[PDB]
Amino acid sequence: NVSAGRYFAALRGPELDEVKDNEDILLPKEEQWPFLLRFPIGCFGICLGLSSQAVLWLALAKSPATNFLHITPLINLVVWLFSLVVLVSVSFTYILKCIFYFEAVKREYFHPVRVNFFFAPWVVCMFLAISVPPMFSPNRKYLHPAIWCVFMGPYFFLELKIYGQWLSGGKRRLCKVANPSSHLSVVGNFVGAILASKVGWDEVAKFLWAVGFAHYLVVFVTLYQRLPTSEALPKELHPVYSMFIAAPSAASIAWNTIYGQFDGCSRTCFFIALFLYISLVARINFFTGFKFSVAWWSYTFPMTTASVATIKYAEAVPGYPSRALALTLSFISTAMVCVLFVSTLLHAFVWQTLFPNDLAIAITKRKL
Amino acid sequence: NVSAGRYFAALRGPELDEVKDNEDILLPKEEQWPFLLRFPIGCFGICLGLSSQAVLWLALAKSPATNFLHITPLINLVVWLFSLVVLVSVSFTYILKCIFYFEAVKREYFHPVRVNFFFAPWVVCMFLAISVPPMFSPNRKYLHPAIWCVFMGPYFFLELKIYGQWLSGGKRRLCKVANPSSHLSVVGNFVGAILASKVGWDEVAKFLWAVGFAHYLVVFVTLYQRLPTSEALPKELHPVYSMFIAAPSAASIAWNTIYGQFDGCSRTCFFIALFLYISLVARINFFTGFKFSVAWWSYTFPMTTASVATIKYAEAVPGYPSRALALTLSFISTAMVCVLFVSTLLHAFVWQTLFPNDLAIAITKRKL
Amino acid sequence: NVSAGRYFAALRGPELDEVKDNEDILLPKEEQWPFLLRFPIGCFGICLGLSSQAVLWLALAKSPATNFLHITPLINLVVWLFSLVVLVSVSFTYILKCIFYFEAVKREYFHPVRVNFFFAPWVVCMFLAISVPPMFSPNRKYLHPAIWCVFMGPYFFLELKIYGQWLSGGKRRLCKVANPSSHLSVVGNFVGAILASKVGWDEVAKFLWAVGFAHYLVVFVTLYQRLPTSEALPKELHPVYSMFIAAPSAASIAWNTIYGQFDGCSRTCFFIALFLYISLVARINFFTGFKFSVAWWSYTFPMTTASVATIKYAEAVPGYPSRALALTLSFISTAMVCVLFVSTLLHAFVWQTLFPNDLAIAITKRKL
DSSP states (O other), X not given: OOOHHHHHHHEETTTTOEEOTXXXXXXXXXXXXXXXXXXXXXXXXXXXXXXXXXXHHHHTTSOXXXXXXXXXXXHHHHHHHHHHHHHHHHHHHHHHHHHHOHHHHHHHHSSTTTTTTSSXXXXXHHHTTTTOOTTTSOSOSSOOTHHHHHHSHHHHHHHHHHHXXXXXXXXXXXXXXXXXXXXXXXXXXXXXXXXXXXXXXXXXXXXXXXXXXXXXHHHHHHTTSOOSOOSSSOSSOOGGGXXXXXXXXXHHHHHHHHHXXXXXXXXXXXXXXXXXXXXXXXXXXXXXXXXXXXXXXXXXXXXXXXXXXXXXHHHHSOSXXXXXXXXHHHHHHHHHHHHHHHHHHHHHHTSOXXXXXXXXXXXXXXXX | OOOHHHHHHHEETTTTOEEOTXXXXXXXXXXXXXXXXXXXXXXXXXXXXXXXXXXXXXXXXXXXXXXGGOOOTHHHHHHHHHHHHHHHHHHHHHHHHHHHOHHHHHHHHSSTTTTTTSSHHHHHHHHTTTTOOTTTSOSOSSOOTHHHHHHSHHHHHHHHHHHHHHHSSSSSSGGGTOOGGGGGGTTHHHHHHHHHHTTTOHHHHHHHHHHXXXXXXXXXXXXXXXXXXXXXXXXSOOGGGGGGTHHHHHHHHXXXXXXXXXXXXXXXHHHHHHHHHHHHHSSSHHHHOOOOOGGGGGGTHHHHHHHHHHHHHHHHXXXXXXXXXXXXXXXXXHHHHHHHHHHHHHHHHTSOOSXXXXXXXXXXXXXX | OOOHHHHHHHEETTTTOEEOXXXXXXXXXXXXXXXXXXXXXXXXXHHHHHHTHHHHHHHTTSOGGGGGGOOXXXXXXXXXXXXXHHHHHHHHHHHHHHHHOHHHHHHHHSSTTTTTTSSHHHHHHHHTTTTOOTTTSOSOSSOOTHHHHHHSHHHHHHHHHHHHHHHSSSSSSGGGTOOGGGGGGTTHHHHHHHXXXXXXXXHHHHHHHHHHHHHHHHHHHHTTSOOSOOSSSOSSOOGGGGGGTHHHHHHHHHHHHHHSSOOHHHHHHHHHHHHHHHHHHSSSHXXXXXXXXXXXXXXXXXXXXXXXXXXXXXXXXXXXXXXXXXXXXXXXXXXXXXXXXXXXXXXXXXXXXXXXOOGGGSBOSSOO
C-alpha cells in the first residue's frame, strides 16, 4: 500500500503516468504483459467524451434558439447507441480485471490522479439518462425515481468516504492529494441534480447543488496555493486545465432546470466558465501543440458541457450575438471529437499502440 | 507570555489539554491545587448546551409544523430557568478567578483553543433573550434595543481585536492559530443578527450577517490546508468536527428572520449543514466511541442549532418527509443532553472527578 | 531578469522600496541620477487619488440624498480638469522613460509590488469617463461604445496574461507573488462594468462582474495564509491595508447600475467594505502615525470609493442615520487629499525631495 507522497516522488507527467529515469519497478519493461494489466481505468474517459456529445446534439435539435438549422434528431440516436455499446464494453472488461488482478486495481485506487476515475462510470450513466432519444421514450413528463437511486446511489456513498478524508487530518487530506483532476469528484453533484429534477424531486436537487457548490469553492481555492503537487501542475497552460470549466458549466444548467429561469445566479456561474474557456482555447499553442493520448478524451468532455450551457444562454438572451457564440463553441467541441475518433482507430488497428505496458502501477514502495 | 507555537509543541490532544511525556511544568502534579486554578473556562460550554435547548423546546411548542404533538410550553420554563442559574453560577466563580489568579486567566487567553471560549459567555446571553418564556414576556412585538447593545457590545469589541490580528502579519495570524474551535468566533454574528431583528433593527442585522458570512468562508477554507496545527486536527472523524455545523445552521435561521422567507439563499446554508451532519453522525463509531469529558457539552450545542433550522424548513416545505426529518434530528440532540446531564452529576458527587489539576496552563516557556 | 524571490530577499519595507543594509547595487548611491531613472511608476497613484475625487463631488451634487447641501457642480469642473492635466503629464514623461531607459521599465514590471501599477493608467481613464461634467456632455442617454473598447481593451489583454500565470505552476503563480497591492489587478473589472452599462451593454457588464468576483475571492483568502511574502505584510495595521476596501466598494456600485436596485447582494458587498473601513480608520495611530510618501496617494483612492458607495446606500435607505454616515466618510476622504495636496507642493518646490535615487531597481541578480 503505497503512500500518496511516494506517487509524486516516483512518477512524472501531468497525469503521473511515466516513471522517472532512476526508479526501479516490480515488473519487466520490455516483455509484453497480460492484457488485463495493460488496461487502465482512464479509458472511462472515452465514455465521458461520447455520452456528453449525445446531450449536445439533442439540445441542438430541440431548442428554439437553434431552430433555423433544422438538425435531424437521428444524430442523437447514433451517438446515444454508440456511447452505450462502448460503456457496456469498457465496464465488462474492467470487472474481469477486478476478478483476476485485484491487486492492480488497488494500486489505481490509491494513485492520486486515478482516484477520480472511479466516479466516472456513474457520471456516464447520468448523461445517458438525461438525453434519451424521444423515439424510445415518448409520452412522459417525469422519469421514474428508481433511475435516480441506482445511478446516484453509489456516487453518493463513495462521495461521503472521500470528502470525509479531505477535511480530516490524516495522510490523504486534500492539501496532500490535490490536482486538476479532483474537479471530477465534484461535477457529479450537478449532473445528479439535473436528473433529480427530471424524476420530480426538486428538493433533492437543491440538496445536491449545495454540496457541489461548497466543495467546488474548496478545490478552486486550494489549487492556487503552495502544496506538494509538483509535476502534476504544469508550468504553462496545458490542456489538463480544462477540468476547471466542467463544474461552473454544469452548475448553471442545473440551477436553470430547478428554478426555470436563467437568472443572476445562473449567469455568474456561466460567465466564470466562459472566461476560463477563452483564457485556454484562444491561443496558438492550443492547436499546434496536439499530441494524442487517451487522456485527451477526458479534456473534451468539459468543453462540450460548456457548449450546452451557451445554448441555454441563447434562449434567455435572444439576438444574433448569442446565436453566434453558441454555434462557435459547439463547433470547436465536435471537431475535436472527430479528430480523436479517427486517431483512436489508427492507434488501435493500424499501428496497434493503444495499450502499452502500464508501468506507473508497478513502482516499488520504499526506495528511490 | 507563551508563544502560540509553543502550545502546539508542548500539549497533546484534540483540545490541547494534556502535557506530553517529556515536558516539565511549573506546578506540582499530585498535590491538590486551590479550587480557582482547577476551574477552566471550557465549562461555559455547559451553558451553551443548556441555553440552546431552551430555543428548541420553544420552537417545538410554538410552530405549526409540530402542532400535532401538543407539547406543553412548561418545558421551556424549566430549561430557561435552569440555564439561567447555571450561567449566573459559572460567571460569578470566574470573576473570582480574575481577582485572585489573573496570571492563570492570561495563560488561557493566549492558549489557541481557549481564546474562543471568551466569546462564549455573550452567546449564551443572546440565546436566553431570543427564547424568553411567554409567561414572563407577553404583549410585545419588539424587545427593547438596549438588550442588544449590552450583550452584542462586548462581543463586537472583542471581535474587532481578534479579526484584525488574523489578517495582519504578526505571530497570531490565522494560519498559525487555526483549529475547529475557531468557528466559535464567527457564530455570534448570526445569533446577534436574530436578536437585532427582534428589537426592530433590520439594517444592523444585515450588517452582522455579512461580516459573519465573509469570515466563515475564510475559516472554512483555511482548515483544508497545510498549517502547523498538528495534534488538534484528528486523523479521523472525531466529535470535535461538529463545530463546522454551527455557523451554516445559524446563518439560515438568521436570513429567514430578516427577509421572512426560507428562500434559495437560506436553503443553500441549511443543506451544507445537513451534509456535514450526515457525514459525522451516520456512523457506528460515533455512538460506541463515547468517553465523557466536559468538552462534550460544547459539541451538543451545534447539533441542537441544526434541529432548530430543520423545524423552520418543515414550515416552508409541508408534508410527511419534512416532519420526519425534523423529529429525528431533535431526538438525537436531546437524548445526548440527557446522557450528559446524568454523567455530569455522577462525576461531580459520586466519584468527585470533574475538576482535576489543570496541567495545561502550567507549562514552561522555553525548553522541551 | 531578477526572480520574484530575490526581490523579497533584497528589499525591505511595506512596498519594497528600500535596500537592506548588506546588499550591493549596480548604480551609485550619492551621485544624482538622470531624471528619467528617478521617476517611478507609483506616481500614477497621484492620478488615482484625484480622478476618484471627481466621481465623489459629482455624486454629492447630483443625488437626492444630499440635496439639502446645495453643492455647486463647478467643483466637478475644477477637479476633472486638474486630474486630466496631471494624467497627460505623468503619461507623457513615462513614455519617454520607455524610449530611453527601457531596461529600468522591465525591472519595475517584474517587481512584485509594481506589477499592479501597470493596470493603474487604464483605471484612471475609466474614472474620468463615468464622471464627465454635464457642462461638456449634455443631452445624452448613453456614451459611445468605442469609449469602452479603447480603455478596457488594454486592461483586458493584460488581465488574461497575469491571471493565466496565477493558476499555472511556474515561478510567478499567486502563492509566490501575493501582497495587498494585488487587489489593484481586480478592481478594474468593476470600474469597467460601470462604464459598460453606461454605453448600453448590460451583458458585457455582467461578464465583468463575474470575473472580478471570482478573482476577488482568490486574493482575499490567499492573504490569510502562509506564503513567502514576509516584509510586505506588516506586523500591525498599516495604511497599506486600505487596498482591501476598494473591490467590495466598487462591486456594490456596479451591481446597482446593472440591476437598478440596491438589493441584498449589493448590501452584502457594501457591509464588508464598511467593516474593513471601521477596523482600520477607527484607531488613534491611524491619525498620529502619518509620514508622507507618494504611496499615500494610492491609499486615499479606496477610501473615496467607499464614500461613493455610502451615498448610494443613503438613497435606498432614507432617514437621518444614513445621511450622517455618508457625510462623515466623505469628509475624512477629502480632508486627506487636502493634506496630501499641500505636502506634495512643499516636498516638490520648497524642499525639493519628491524624486530621490530609486535604489530598489538597481539590485544585483545573484548574491546577498
